[model samples]
Target: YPTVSEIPVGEVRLYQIADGVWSHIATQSFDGAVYPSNGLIVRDGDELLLIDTAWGAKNTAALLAEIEKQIGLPVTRAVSTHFHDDRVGGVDVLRAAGVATYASPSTRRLAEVEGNEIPTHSLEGLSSSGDAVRFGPVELFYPGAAHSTDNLVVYVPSASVLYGGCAIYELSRTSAGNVADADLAEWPTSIERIQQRYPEAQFVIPGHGLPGGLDLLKHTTNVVKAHTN
Candidate 1:
C-alpha cells in the first residue's frame, strides 16, 4: 500500500494513515484488519524519540525520509504504542538503525506472542504513572492505555499538544474502521485518563487523520463508548 501522508502538529509530528489510524493494509489483507496508525517523532535537543513504526519497511523508510526533511536527524528511540502489525511492522528497521525500541508490559506480551518478526529492544518505565520524555524544553507526558491494552498517549506540556496514538482519533465525525482487537470497553476510560492528566491540551495529534483540538478526543471517546457499550 502507499505511504500515509505526513503532517506537522503543534510540537509533535503526526502521520496520517489511509483516512484514519486503523485502515487496512493492502499486502496482508487476511492477516486481520488494521488501523491507519500514527507514528510520533519527539525532538529532545539533538536526540529524537519515535512513537510508533508504520506498516512495513517501505512505509517506515518513507516516514524516516519525511522526518529527515522535517527534523534533519535519525531517530534515537523507537516506541511502539501497541503490538498491532500496523503499529510495529517497522520494528526491525528501527532496530537495525540502532534505535532503542520501547513498549509497555502488555505491548511486549502481545509482540512476543504475535510479533516474532518484529524485534523489540526494551520497556520504558512509567515512574510517575505520568512519566514523560524531557526533550530540551519539550516535556511529553506518556499516559498509559485506552484504545489497546498497551496504549500510551504522549503529551507535550509546553505546547499543550497531546499525541494520542491509536488511543484516539481526530476525525470530525465517527467512523467505523476496525475494532476487533481494540479495547472497546476501556477506550472511553483511556481518553478520560488522558484528559485528566493533560486538561489544558489545546492541540491533539491522533494516530490518524489531521491533528485537532479537544473535540477530537471527545468525539472519539463518545463514539467508541457507543460502539463498545
Candidate 2:
C-alpha cells in the first residue's frame, strides 16, 4: 500500500492499495467505544467515489481532506456497504459537502431504525434483481446477507479489486465480528455468491485489517462456514 497521507486525524490513515484504488483505515471511537474500521476511495477521471466512510463525522472530515489534498478531485458520489456506523456514519457529512450518498433500501431502513441519518439516495440492494449497483466505473454487489442484513461488496473491475466490506472477514480474525447483526447461516453462502460473481478479483479488501488476494475469499468462506456449523 502507498501512503497518501500520514496525517492522523483521530487515528485514521488514507493509503492507496492499487492504481486508482485508495483505502482508508481508522480507529473509530464514539460514546466511550472504539473499534477498527476500513473504507475505500476509488478514482474515475478526476472525481472520486467512497465505498464507505470512517465510523463518524470527525474521521470522515479527515478522510475527505486527505483525499482532496492528494488527488485534488471532488468526491461527487459515495455509498455505504451496510447500515453499520462503520459503513454509513459519514453519510450526513458527505451530503452536506454536496456529495450524493447512497445505500441499499434495506440498509437505509435499518439505518433509520438505528437512528443513523439516511443517505440522499436509496438503492436497490444486491438482494434485488439487478444484484449490482453501478456507479462511476465501480459496482457494489450485495453478496447476500452476512455481516449485516444489507452488507455490500464493491467490485472495481478496472483494477480487479473486490472490496468485500464487513461481510467478508479478514484472514487475521479468528472469528467474524458482531454476530448480533449477522446471518451466519447465510454468511458463507453469500461469500460464495461473490466468489462466483467476481472470480477475477485479484485484490480482496476486507472491512478491517490488511488487504489480501483471492485466498482471502476462501479464508472468509471457511470462517463463516465454521460459524454456521
Candidate 3:
C-alpha cells in the first residue's frame, strides 16, 4: 500500500490507497464549520463494496456516478460503520439505486431514533466486539464503543488496510473530535482492541484526515485518554 492518485469528484475526492481500495473523502459544511468525512470503496471485479458514504444523498449520488464513470464498476453493496449522518446519510440514495445497504442492529435502531435514513438490511454474524465477519474482500469488526456506540471498522486483509472510520483519529489530530456520541471511558479500550486485532495493518485510514501507519492508532488512543481524564 504505497502512495497513489486522487480523483476529485465535486466535493468528494477518491484516493487510491491500495491496489483495489480507494478512500472516498467528502466535504461537509454546517454551522460555519467545514470538514471532510472519509469512507472506503473496495472494488472486486465489476462490483464495489462501499464502507460509509458521502455527507448526504446529493453528494453520495454524485460520488456513485463518478465511481461508475472512473472506476467502471457499480457498487453492489454498502455498509454503514455507524448511525451518524457522515456514515449513513446516503442510505436513501443507495437504496434507490438498488444497492443493498447493511448496518448493525444498533446502528439501525439509532438511525431510526435520530430520523436519519437507515440502512436497508441488518449485518449479522457480528454480535460482539471480538467478532470479525467477512463481507467479500473485507472484514467488519466491532472493537467496542469509541467515537460511537455502534462504530464498526473495516479491514482489508489482502492490502493490510484498516478503515477505522471515526473511531481512530489521524496522526495530525490533537483532539478527540466530535465527542457528542463518543464513549470516552471505553474509547481507549476499543483503540487497544483494534491495535491487537490488526497488528499487521500497514495502512490505517481515519474518518477525517490523511491515512497513516500504526501511529494513527497510537494517536487515537492518546487523544481518547486526554479527553477521558
Best by lDDT: 3
lDDT of each: 0.62, 0.80, 0.86
Candidate that scores best on TM-score? 3
Clashes of each: 7, 0, 0
In order of appearance, the predictions have TM-scores of 0.75, 0.90, 0.94
Residue clash pairs of candidate 3 = none
Candidate 3 segments exceeding 4 Å error: 1-10
Per TM-score, what order, best first?
3, 2, 1
Q: Which 10-residue window in model 1 sums to the lowest lDDT?
A: 18-27
- Cα lDDT tens digits, model 2, 1-229, are 4221433437567777778888878775546655556788899888888888887888788778878788788999898888987788888888898889988889889999999978879776456522886877798887778888788888898999888888777788877667899888877788788888898888888887778888888898788777777
Q: How close is candidate 3 to the true structure, as a TM-score?
A: 0.94
Cα displacement (Å) at residue 132, model 3 = 1.2
Error of 2 at 54 (Å): 0.6
Candidate 3 — what's its lDDT? 0.86
